[PDB]
């Protein structure tokens, strides 16, 4: 119920990995989606992979 | 099988010249900006030099500002460093990474997080 701009998180580069899978970083402005979800946790490095 | 691989260091003489050798497999270095860093002993990370995507836009260091030269390869999908009037304060292994444009206007002065590093050179300085 809300309008993102991804176009903000792509483009600032305050990011290491744009791993997306099943999209490509600079569309997901463009497409429309039902609901998104969000998950958050820090790791090592090494095992980011 | 983002891969950035840095070839070309070794030990060479204060006063001398080195070439470095920045490869990527498994993706295209094209798409992205490259920057250089350092990492000596007992120092914290300091940016070597920042090239962007283009190449049109270049960034440099005061601490090597004169001396180090960039330049890349996008066809071949490699970017050189090209240093020359070295000095023992350069003894550091060296990284190079990938990153995009972190804000509004072309250069890339500004430092920014890095997604992928290297394994990493040591280019060693005494004489």
């Known amino acids: 119920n809300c309008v993102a701009d991804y176009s903000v998180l792509y483009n600032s580069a305050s990011f290491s990995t744009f791993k997306c899978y099943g999209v490509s970083p600079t569309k997901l402005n463009d497409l429309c989606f039902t609901n998104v979800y969000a998950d958050s946790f820090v790791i090592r490095g090494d095992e980011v992979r | 099988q983002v891969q950035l691989q840095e070839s070309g260091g070794g030990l060479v003489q204060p006063g001398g010249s080195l070439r470095l050798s920045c490869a990527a497999s498994?993706?295209?270095?094209?798409?992205?900006?490259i920057g250089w860093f350092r990492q000596a002993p007992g120092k914290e990370r300091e940016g070597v030099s920042c090239?962007?995507?283009?190449?049109?836009?270049?960034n440099y260091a005061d601490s090597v500002k004169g001396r180090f030269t960039i330049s890349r390869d996008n066809t071949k999908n490699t970017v050189y460093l090209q240093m020359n009037s070295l000095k023992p304060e350069d003894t550091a292994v060296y990284y190079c990474?990938?990153?995009?444009?972190?804000?509004?206007?072309?250069?890339?002065?500004?430092?920014?997080?890095?997604?992928?590093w290297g394994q990493g050179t040591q280019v060693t300085v005494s004489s």
């Open positions: 090239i962007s995507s283009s190449g049109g836009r270049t």
């Open positions: 498994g993706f295209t270095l094209d798409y992205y900006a």
């Open positions: 990474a990938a990153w995009e444009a972190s804000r509004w206007y072309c250069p890339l002065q500004f430092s920014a997080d890095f997604s992928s």
